[PDB]
């Protein structure tokens, strides 16, 4: 009946959304860290290739490794630019819009939870409309509904209650009077009229919305209405719901091309054709056949398999055992960490500088 | 008087906090972008130094340039690690805690704003208790209070209303009945008792807290009480969480992100590289490091580091690598991917020298 407290069909979908929004900051942290980690993996591969080229200087394999190093360094560079220009804003915006909406929802739900007169009459009722609900251990009537923002640790992004189309559980409600409102439970938050609702000497001036525009509480003796938010379009009285949906839909994760390796052959791999043109052919506009001829010299082919074969040689190359910890691995593919590999590269650059002096003086 | 609508002295301090929290995400975007920008500047310097070394093999300054390149590469590497491990969590946490608390505040304020019966009687009153207030642009009754999360662009946040000690405007209240509540305005949100408040057939069964625990609405015919939040220490936890997350922020200002102005031997990476690659010993005396540095830098002070950086910045690259009529000095070039491919060119030239020398 109009003007009565709200059964679980009304508030449980709001709890589900609230608990899912609580994971958006966790997913933002996961994605920002994943982007950095992937840049670091690109940089490690660039550094291993660079070190191989210094050790094996003056060979066709070393020239292949210069091409490999350039590829991976350009990927690391472009990934950092994408993290700066695109991912940071995507993830800050998703975190902020989700957390803001979660605060709007949680304040409303926490108000319903506390606005009760007894174990059988209040604003937040169980499934049947028999008892008011209570919060215990992060649940309300068994429903996960912490009504707090949890401590933030990285957690992989997911989507169940807020997805590409909208908020799955926030569907059109055709009979709020029977499915949302109880028959008996008293709740002045269910109405703006004065007899049973928020009005004192008379009705409120106008309808009142709550939970960032989700529910409309009329100033007359009639049931609430709710927005259907399951089929959203970019646009509102319920704008925070749209904002969080749009920001979440916009997320790519650390999964754009900068962050991923390529499997489309050598000439088309990032940086390769331009480096062959500029450093080997020393001409501005070459034909694909000329690129392929050069690649054959250094990779013995132009397919993924020949790139992988050079990468295996790089990975198998050992460094001097004094450059790593006692009893620690020395093959480049067994070493990781940017700062670690950077100083090994410096060692081999100084070896190259010294060998150059000996050979030319 | 108890059980009446709230005058502006009650809700305006909440608007001030809400407006300031709106900038916390702007500060997160600012700092994450600044960290990446600073890493990129370190990487550009590493690349310029590396290019100089590849070009000038045969001179002692080329070895100085290897040391310079290593220094900046290590700074870039460590900055990315700090962005990953430390700044990202700091800034996500500040964004989330501030935005969450702002949503709690704004839902409460927006309920007060709408819960009115006329132009002179409602839950959200002006300073004097004369008129109910209305939303007007980005204000409520003229007080900046958008009750929205604004579009995010990079900006450093103010710390006027949420600072190191707490929420400066949310002080202990000596007389809520007279200072927060009006004399006449009706407001069922001002108490939990049934005659004038939220109860229907009887009083609510307990006090109700609102705005993430800021205000406590008694279930009897009495004025609200509020938390003093101006002197915090590690039921109103969201206020604490936003305060601690904001004060924890360093910005992109830790050592990884800043250049060093002291001696050469104490610059990041330098002494270890001299020991490992030049002296080829696990331990060394400071004397010995200085002697090596003088061979390559002609000294060991910041002035000699600057002088090598000037040689690096003045070195031209081949015109075909930058385009017609474009600058050729390394110090006139910027952009990591741009400099990376120039380094690859000069590495290919080095390989061609060794192919004949060997």
């Amino acid at each position, epitope marked *: 009946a109009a003007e009565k407290g709200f059964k679980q069909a009304f508030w449980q979908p709001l709890c589900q959304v609230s608990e899912e929004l609580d994971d958006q900051p966790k997913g933002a942290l996961f994605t920002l860290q994943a982007a950095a980690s992937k840049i670091q993996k690109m940089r490690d591969a660039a550094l291993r290739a660079s070190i191989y080229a210094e050790i094996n200087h003056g060979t066709n394999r070393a020239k292949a490794a210069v091409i490999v190093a350039n590829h991976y360094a350009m990927k690391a560079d472009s990934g950092l630019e994408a993290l700066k220009q695109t991912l940071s804003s995507q993830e800050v915006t998703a975190t902020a819009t989700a957390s803001y909406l979660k605060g709007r929802i949680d304040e409303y739900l926490n108000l319903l939870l506390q606005t009760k007169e007894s174990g059988t009459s209040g604003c937040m009722m169980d499934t049947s409309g028999t008892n008011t609900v209570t919060k215990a251990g992060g649940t309300i009537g068994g429903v996960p509904c912490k009504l707090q923002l949890s401590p933030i640790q990285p957690k992989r992004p997911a989507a169940t209650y807020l997805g590409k189309a909208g908020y799955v559980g926030l569907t059109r409600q055709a009979d709020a009077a029977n499915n949302f409102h109880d028959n008996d439970a008293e709740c002045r938050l269910a109405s703006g009229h004065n007899t049973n609702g928020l009005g004192k000497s008379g009705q409120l001036s106008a309808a009142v919305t709550m939970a960032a525009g989700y529910v409309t509480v009329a100033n007359s003796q009639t049931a609430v209405t709710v927005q259907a938010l399951d089929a959203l379009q970019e646009a509102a009285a319920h704008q925070p719901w749209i904002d969080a949906w749009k920001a979440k839909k916009a997320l790519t994760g650390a999964e754009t091309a900068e962050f991923r390796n390529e499997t489309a052959g050598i000439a088309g791999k990032t940086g390769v054709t331009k480096l062959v043109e500029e450093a080997l052919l020393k001409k501005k506009d070459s034909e694909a056949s000329e690129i392929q001829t050069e690649l054959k010299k250094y990779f013995s082919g132009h397919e993924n398999e020949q790139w992988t074969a050079i990468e295996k040689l790089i990975s198998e190359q050992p460094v001097a055992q004094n450059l790593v910890g006692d009893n620690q691995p020395t093959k480049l593919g067994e070493l990781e960490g940017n700062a670690k590999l950077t100083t090994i590269l410096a060692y081999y650059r100084m070896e190259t500088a010294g060998k150059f002096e000996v050979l030319t003086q | 008087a108890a059980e009446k609508g709230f005058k502006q002295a009650f809700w305006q301090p909440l608007c001030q906090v809400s407006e300031e929290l709106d900038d916390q995400p702007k500060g997160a975007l600012f700092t994450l972008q600044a960290a990446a920008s600073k890493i990129q500047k370190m990487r550009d310097a590493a690349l310029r130094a590396s290019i100089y070394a590849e070009i000038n093999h045969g001179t002692n300054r080329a070895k100085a340039a290897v040391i310079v390149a290593n220094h900046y590469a290590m700074k870039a590497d460590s900055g990315l*690690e700090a962005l990953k491990q430390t700044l990202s969590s700091q800034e996500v946490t500040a964004t989330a805690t501030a935005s969450y608390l702002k949503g709690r505040i704004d839902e409460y304020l927006n309920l007060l704003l709408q819960t009115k019966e006329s132009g002179t009687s409602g839950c959200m009153m002006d300073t004097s208790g004369t008129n109910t207030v209305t939303k007007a642009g980005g204000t409520i009754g003229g007080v900046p209070c958008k009750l929205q999360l604004s579009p995010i662009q990079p900006k450093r946040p103010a710390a006027t209303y949420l600072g190191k000690a707490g929420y400066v405007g949310l002080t202990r209240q000596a007389d809520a009945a007279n200072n927060f509540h009006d004399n006449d305005a009706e407001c069922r949100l001002a108490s939990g008792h049934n005659t004038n408040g939220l109860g229907k057939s009887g009083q609510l069964s307990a006090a109700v807290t609102m705005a993430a625990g800021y205000v406590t609405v008694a279930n009897s015919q009495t004025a609200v009480t509020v938390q003093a939040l101006d002197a915090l220490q590690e039921a109103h936890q969201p206020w604490i969480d936003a305060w601690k997350a904001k004060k924890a922020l360093t910005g992109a200002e830790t050592a990884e992100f800043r250049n060093e102005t002291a001696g050469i031997a104490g610059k990041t990476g330098v002494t270890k590289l001299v020991e490992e690659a030049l002296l080829k010993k696990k331990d060394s005396e400071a004397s010995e490091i200085q002697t090596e540095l003088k061979k390559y830098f002609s000294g060991h002070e910041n002035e000699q580091w600057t002088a090598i950086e000037k040689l690096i910045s003045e070195q031209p690259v081949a015109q075909n690598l930058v385009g017609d009529n474009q600058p050729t000095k390394l110090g006139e070039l910027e952009g990591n991917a741009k400099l990376t491919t120039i380094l690859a060119y000069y590495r290919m030239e080095t390989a061609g020298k060794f192919e004949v020398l060997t």
Partner: nanobody
Amino acid sequence: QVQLQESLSCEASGLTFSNYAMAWFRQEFVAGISWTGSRTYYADSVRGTSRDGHKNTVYLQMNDTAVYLCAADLLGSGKDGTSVYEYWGQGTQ
């Protein structure tokens, strides 16, 4: 807001602990540990320190009267010859 606070234990706040060598001083260098956690160094005087990366803490198992200070050095060796500590604690007497 980087802070090193001694209590021996030294906890680093606001900093990527794994980027820093950490050292103990006295008022002279007392002990130090490399950024990688693999090497240890000691003042002659004190001959005969540890770190927990999960707790952002460096320890000094003591088995001398001065204020003992904690210090961090970016990507440092763990010594105190030519190094420059970027962050300093307040000290524990």
